[PDB]
mmCIF file of all heavy atoms in Angstrom:
data_model
loop_
_atom_site.group_PDB
_atom_site.id
_atom_site.type_symbol
_atom_site.label_atom_id
_atom_site.label_comp_id
_atom_site.label_asym_id
_atom_site.label_seq_id
_atom_site.Cartn_x
_atom_site.Cartn_y
_atom_site.Cartn_z
ATOM 1 N N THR A 193 -27.045 -110.708 128.345
ATOM 2 C CA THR A 193 -26.872 -111.817 129.043
ATOM 3 C C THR A 193 -25.485 -112.431 128.671
ATOM 4 O O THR A 193 -25.282 -112.440 127.556
ATOM 5 C CB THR A 193 -27.924 -112.990 128.901
ATOM 6 O OG1 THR A 193 -29.181 -112.400 128.832
ATOM 7 C CG2 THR A 193 -27.781 -114.041 130.052
ATOM 8 N N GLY A 194 -24.570 -112.477 129.751
ATOM 9 C CA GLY A 194 -23.227 -113.000 129.480
ATOM 10 C C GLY A 194 -22.217 -111.886 129.192
ATOM 11 O O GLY A 194 -22.643 -110.747 129.175
ATOM 12 N N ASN A 195 -21.035 -112.178 129.191
ATOM 13 C CA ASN A 195 -19.875 -111.316 129.017
ATOM 14 C C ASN A 195 -19.807 -110.745 127.594
ATOM 15 O O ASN A 195 -20.594 -111.147 126.704
ATOM 16 C CB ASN A 195 -18.598 -111.939 129.474
ATOM 17 C CG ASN A 195 -18.005 -113.119 128.782
ATOM 18 O OD1 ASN A 195 -18.635 -113.493 127.669
ATOM 19 N ND2 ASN A 195 -16.993 -113.769 129.231
ATOM 20 N N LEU A 196 -18.776 -109.952 127.341
ATOM 21 C CA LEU A 196 -18.541 -109.237 126.100
ATOM 22 C C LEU A 196 -18.286 -110.258 124.912
ATOM 23 O O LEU A 196 -18.795 -110.092 123.837
ATOM 24 C CB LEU A 196 -17.416 -108.175 126.221
ATOM 25 C CG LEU A 196 -16.820 -107.598 125.003
ATOM 26 C CD1 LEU A 196 -17.997 -106.654 124.373
ATOM 27 C CD2 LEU A 196 -15.602 -106.786 125.313
ATOM 28 N N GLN A 197 -17.254 -111.219 125.152
ATOM 29 C CA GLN A 197 -16.902 -112.101 124.087
ATOM 30 C C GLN A 197 -18.012 -113.057 123.709
ATOM 31 O O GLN A 197 -18.329 -113.024 122.407
ATOM 32 C CB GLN A 197 -15.576 -112.876 124.643
ATOM 33 C CG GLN A 197 -15.336 -113.901 123.508
ATOM 34 C CD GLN A 197 -13.769 -114.278 123.441
ATOM 35 O OE1 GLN A 197 -13.116 -114.170 124.422
ATOM 36 N NE2 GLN A 197 -13.390 -114.603 122.305
ATOM 37 N N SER A 198 -18.807 -113.489 124.489
ATOM 38 C CA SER A 198 -19.894 -114.412 124.110
ATOM 39 C C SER A 198 -21.037 -113.651 123.259
ATOM 40 O O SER A 198 -21.536 -114.245 122.391
ATOM 41 C CB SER A 198 -20.668 -114.999 125.314
ATOM 42 O OG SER A 198 -21.258 -113.955 126.135
ATOM 43 N N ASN A 199 -21.269 -112.360 123.594
ATOM 44 C CA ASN A 199 -22.282 -111.599 122.784
ATOM 45 C C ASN A 199 -21.642 -111.021 121.394
ATOM 46 O O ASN A 199 -22.336 -110.975 120.466
ATOM 47 C CB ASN A 199 -22.656 -110.453 123.683
ATOM 48 C CG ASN A 199 -23.622 -110.736 124.753
ATOM 49 O OD1 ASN A 199 -24.808 -111.174 124.467
ATOM 50 N ND2 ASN A 199 -23.235 -110.657 125.993
ATOM 51 N N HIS A 200 -20.360 -110.765 121.377
ATOM 52 C CA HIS A 200 -19.703 -110.322 120.266
ATOM 53 C C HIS A 200 -19.668 -111.339 119.312
ATOM 54 O O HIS A 200 -20.002 -111.248 118.146
ATOM 55 C CB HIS A 200 -18.250 -109.607 120.510
ATOM 56 C CG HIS A 200 -17.413 -109.586 119.419
ATOM 57 N ND1 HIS A 200 -16.472 -110.454 119.009
ATOM 58 C CD2 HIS A 200 -17.261 -108.520 118.377
ATOM 59 C CE1 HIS A 200 -15.899 -110.152 117.933
ATOM 60 N NE2 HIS A 200 -16.338 -108.848 117.487
ATOM 61 N N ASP A 201 -19.056 -112.515 119.729
ATOM 62 C CA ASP A 201 -18.820 -113.816 118.917
ATOM 63 C C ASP A 201 -20.078 -114.420 118.421
ATOM 64 O O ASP A 201 -20.035 -115.341 117.544
ATOM 65 C CB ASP A 201 -18.070 -114.790 119.739
ATOM 66 C CG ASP A 201 -16.605 -114.427 119.959
ATOM 67 O OD1 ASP A 201 -16.126 -113.375 119.516
ATOM 68 O OD2 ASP A 201 -15.771 -115.353 120.630
ATOM 69 N N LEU A 202 -21.305 -113.904 118.748
ATOM 70 C CA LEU A 202 -22.549 -114.428 118.162
ATOM 71 C C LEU A 202 -22.762 -113.905 116.683
ATOM 72 O O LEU A 202 -23.447 -114.496 115.976
ATOM 73 C CB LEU A 202 -23.796 -113.887 119.040
ATOM 74 C CG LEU A 202 -24.165 -114.767 120.240
ATOM 75 C CD1 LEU A 202 -25.286 -114.066 120.991
ATOM 76 C CD2 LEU A 202 -24.495 -116.139 119.878
ATOM 77 N N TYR A 203 -22.063 -112.703 116.518
ATOM 78 C CA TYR A 203 -22.307 -111.985 115.229
ATOM 79 C C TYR A 203 -21.081 -111.668 114.434
ATOM 80 O O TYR A 203 -21.119 -111.228 113.399
ATOM 81 C CB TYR A 203 -23.010 -110.599 115.532
ATOM 82 C CG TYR A 203 -24.183 -110.613 116.552
ATOM 83 C CD1 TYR A 203 -24.102 -109.904 117.627
ATOM 84 C CD2 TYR A 203 -25.234 -111.496 116.314
ATOM 85 C CE1 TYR A 203 -25.142 -110.063 118.556
ATOM 86 C CE2 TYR A 203 -26.227 -111.530 117.172
ATOM 87 C CZ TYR A 203 -26.228 -110.846 118.361
ATOM 88 O OH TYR A 203 -27.232 -110.766 119.209
ATOM 89 N N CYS A 204 -19.834 -111.904 115.074
ATOM 90 C CA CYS A 204 -18.585 -111.543 114.433
ATOM 91 C C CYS A 204 -17.496 -112.563 114.656
ATOM 92 O O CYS A 204 -17.203 -112.959 115.799
ATOM 93 C CB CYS A 204 -18.200 -110.195 114.747
ATOM 94 S SG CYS A 204 -16.560 -109.598 114.140
ATOM 95 N N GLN A 205 -16.910 -112.966 113.562
ATOM 96 C CA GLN A 205 -15.749 -114.012 113.664
ATOM 97 C C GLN A 205 -14.461 -113.269 113.220
ATOM 98 O O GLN A 205 -13.414 -114.030 113.092
ATOM 99 C CB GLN A 205 -16.055 -115.198 112.657
ATOM 100 C CG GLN A 205 -17.327 -115.705 113.009
ATOM 101 C CD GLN A 205 -17.682 -116.229 114.275
ATOM 102 O OE1 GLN A 205 -16.881 -116.815 115.011
ATOM 103 N NE2 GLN A 205 -18.913 -115.659 114.871
ATOM 104 N N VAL A 206 -14.345 -112.026 112.889
ATOM 105 C CA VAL A 206 -13.161 -111.355 112.391
ATOM 106 C C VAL A 206 -12.278 -110.728 113.596
ATOM 107 O O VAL A 206 -11.083 -110.699 113.528
ATOM 108 C CB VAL A 206 -13.650 -110.188 111.464
ATOM 109 C CG1 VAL A 206 -12.476 -109.107 111.224
ATOM 110 C CG2 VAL A 206 -14.093 -110.816 110.218
ATOM 111 N N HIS A 207 -13.019 -110.233 114.753
ATOM 112 C CA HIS A 207 -12.284 -109.773 115.797
ATOM 113 C C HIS A 207 -12.014 -110.823 116.946
ATOM 114 O O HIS A 207 -13.052 -111.432 117.352
ATOM 115 C CB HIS A 207 -13.078 -108.554 116.455
ATOM 116 C CG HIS A 207 -13.212 -107.445 115.480
ATOM 117 N ND1 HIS A 207 -14.545 -107.127 115.242
ATOM 118 C CD2 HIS A 207 -12.439 -106.800 114.733
ATOM 119 C CE1 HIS A 207 -14.384 -106.110 114.355
ATOM 120 N NE2 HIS A 207 -13.045 -105.836 114.072
ATOM 121 N N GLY A 208 -10.835 -111.129 117.212
ATOM 122 C CA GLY A 208 -10.394 -112.164 118.155
ATOM 123 C C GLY A 208 -10.082 -111.541 119.584
ATOM 124 O O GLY A 208 -10.077 -110.313 119.687
ATOM 125 N N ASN A 209 -10.081 -112.376 120.502
ATOM 126 C CA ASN A 209 -9.630 -111.926 121.898
ATOM 127 C C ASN A 209 -8.272 -112.276 122.208
ATOM 128 O O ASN A 209 -8.067 -113.383 122.830
ATOM 129 C CB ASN A 209 -10.649 -112.430 122.905
ATOM 130 C CG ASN A 209 -10.435 -111.879 124.364
ATOM 131 O OD1 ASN A 209 -9.825 -110.731 124.491
ATOM 132 N ND2 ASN A 209 -10.558 -112.817 125.226
ATOM 133 N N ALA A 210 -7.300 -111.443 121.883
ATOM 134 C CA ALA A 210 -5.812 -111.779 122.260
ATOM 135 C C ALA A 210 -5.478 -111.363 123.630
ATOM 136 O O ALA A 210 -4.358 -111.197 124.002
ATOM 137 C CB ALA A 210 -4.917 -110.986 121.276
ATOM 138 N N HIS A 211 -6.522 -111.323 124.558
ATOM 139 C CA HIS A 211 -6.407 -111.022 125.910
ATOM 140 C C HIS A 211 -5.657 -109.812 126.214
ATOM 141 O O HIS A 211 -4.744 -109.827 127.107
ATOM 142 C CB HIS A 211 -5.931 -112.246 126.753
ATOM 143 C CG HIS A 211 -6.834 -113.457 126.651
ATOM 144 N ND1 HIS A 211 -6.662 -114.236 125.588
ATOM 145 C CD2 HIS A 211 -7.850 -113.775 127.399
ATOM 146 C CE1 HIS A 211 -7.539 -115.379 125.773
ATOM 147 N NE2 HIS A 211 -8.380 -115.089 126.910
ATOM 148 N N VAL A 212 -6.029 -108.731 125.486
ATOM 149 C CA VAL A 212 -5.341 -107.355 125.619
ATOM 150 C C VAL A 212 -6.593 -106.431 125.560
ATOM 151 O O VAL A 212 -7.510 -106.624 124.901
ATOM 152 C CB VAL A 212 -4.185 -107.247 124.678
ATOM 153 C CG1 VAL A 212 -4.671 -107.520 123.193
ATOM 154 C CG2 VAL A 212 -3.551 -105.904 124.599
ATOM 155 N N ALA A 213 -6.381 -105.231 126.324
ATOM 156 C CA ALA A 213 -7.283 -104.271 126.415
ATOM 157 C C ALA A 213 -7.985 -103.624 125.089
ATOM 158 O O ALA A 213 -9.225 -103.556 124.968
ATOM 159 C CB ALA A 213 -6.872 -103.089 127.313
ATOM 160 N N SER A 214 -7.049 -103.441 124.051
ATOM 161 C CA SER A 214 -7.557 -102.972 122.772
ATOM 162 C C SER A 214 -8.475 -104.013 122.111
ATOM 163 O O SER A 214 -9.341 -103.628 121.311
ATOM 164 C CB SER A 214 -6.364 -102.505 121.843
ATOM 165 O OG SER A 214 -5.537 -103.630 121.661
ATOM 166 N N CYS A 215 -8.307 -105.250 122.440
ATOM 167 C CA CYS A 215 -9.152 -106.342 121.825
ATOM 168 C C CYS A 215 -10.529 -106.241 122.271
ATOM 169 O O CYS A 215 -11.474 -106.344 121.452
ATOM 170 C CB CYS A 215 -8.581 -107.612 122.056
ATOM 171 S SG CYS A 215 -7.247 -108.279 121.066
ATOM 172 N N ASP A 216 -10.696 -105.893 123.436
ATOM 173 C CA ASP A 216 -12.100 -105.688 124.186
ATOM 174 C C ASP A 216 -12.769 -104.517 123.670
ATOM 175 O O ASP A 216 -13.871 -104.526 123.283
ATOM 176 C CB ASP A 216 -11.920 -105.714 125.760
ATOM 177 C CG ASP A 216 -11.618 -107.035 126.329
ATOM 178 O OD1 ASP A 216 -11.882 -108.135 125.615
ATOM 179 O OD2 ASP A 216 -10.800 -106.994 127.392
ATOM 180 N N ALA A 217 -11.886 -103.412 123.501
ATOM 181 C CA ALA A 217 -12.338 -102.089 122.992
ATOM 182 C C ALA A 217 -12.923 -102.184 121.593
ATOM 183 O O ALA A 217 -13.941 -101.641 121.254
ATOM 184 C CB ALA A 217 -11.034 -101.127 122.982
ATOM 185 N N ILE A 218 -12.340 -103.016 120.694
ATOM 186 C CA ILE A 218 -12.584 -103.341 119.394
ATOM 187 C C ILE A 218 -13.950 -104.127 119.486
ATOM 188 O O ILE A 218 -14.880 -103.610 118.675
ATOM 189 C CB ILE A 218 -11.385 -104.019 118.673
ATOM 190 C CG1 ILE A 218 -10.281 -102.990 118.295
ATOM 191 C CG2 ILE A 218 -11.986 -104.652 117.210
ATOM 192 C CD1 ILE A 218 -9.101 -103.602 117.830
ATOM 193 N N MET A 219 -14.113 -105.285 120.190
ATOM 194 C CA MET A 219 -15.183 -105.986 120.260
ATOM 195 C C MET A 219 -16.418 -105.245 120.717
ATOM 196 O O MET A 219 -17.566 -105.413 120.302
ATOM 197 C CB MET A 219 -14.958 -107.299 121.212
ATOM 198 C CG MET A 219 -14.043 -108.232 120.569
ATOM 199 S SD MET A 219 -14.176 -109.852 121.496
ATOM 200 C CE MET A 219 -13.456 -109.537 122.974
ATOM 201 N N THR A 220 -16.265 -104.230 121.605
ATOM 202 C CA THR A 220 -17.261 -103.375 122.285
ATOM 203 C C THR A 220 -17.801 -102.485 121.295
ATOM 204 O O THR A 220 -19.100 -102.514 121.107
ATOM 205 C CB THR A 220 -16.662 -102.657 123.509
ATOM 206 O OG1 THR A 220 -16.198 -103.468 124.483
ATOM 207 C CG2 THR A 220 -17.800 -101.663 124.060
ATOM 208 N N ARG A 221 -17.033 -101.806 120.536
ATOM 209 C CA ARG A 221 -17.475 -100.843 119.357
ATOM 210 C C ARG A 221 -18.153 -101.637 118.236
ATOM 211 O O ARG A 221 -19.211 -101.294 117.779
ATOM 212 C CB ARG A 221 -16.310 -100.010 118.808
ATOM 213 C CG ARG A 221 -16.911 -98.890 118.000
ATOM 214 C CD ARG A 221 -15.758 -98.272 117.046
ATOM 215 N NE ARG A 221 -16.184 -97.758 115.868
ATOM 216 C CZ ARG A 221 -16.405 -98.446 114.719
ATOM 217 N NH1 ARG A 221 -16.102 -99.690 114.685
ATOM 218 N NH2 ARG A 221 -16.931 -97.831 113.708
ATOM 219 N N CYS A 222 -17.543 -102.844 118.004
ATOM 220 C CA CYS A 222 -18.137 -103.749 116.970
ATOM 221 C C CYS A 222 -19.544 -104.267 117.382
ATOM 222 O O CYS A 222 -20.424 -104.155 116.532
ATOM 223 C CB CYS A 222 -17.211 -104.923 116.780
ATOM 224 S SG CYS A 222 -17.822 -106.337 115.837
ATOM 225 N N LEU A 223 -19.794 -104.669 118.738
ATOM 226 C CA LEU A 223 -20.997 -104.972 119.189
ATOM 227 C C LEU A 223 -22.052 -103.879 119.138
ATOM 228 O O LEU A 223 -23.276 -104.126 118.710
ATOM 229 C CB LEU A 223 -20.972 -105.614 120.641
ATOM 230 C CG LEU A 223 -22.220 -106.227 121.272
ATOM 231 C CD1 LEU A 223 -22.756 -107.347 120.454
ATOM 232 C CD2 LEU A 223 -21.978 -106.476 122.692
#
Side-chain angles (χ1 to χ4, degrees):
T193 316
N195 66 8
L196 174 67
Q197 175 146 31
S198 66
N199 283 292
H200 165 267
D201 292 0
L202 275 178
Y203 319 119
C204 178
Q205 312 306 311
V206 164
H207 303 120
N209 180 36
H211 300 88
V212 52
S214 58
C215 280
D216 293 331
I218 291 173
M219 287 200 288
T220 300
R221 191 193 154 275
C222 173
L223 182 65

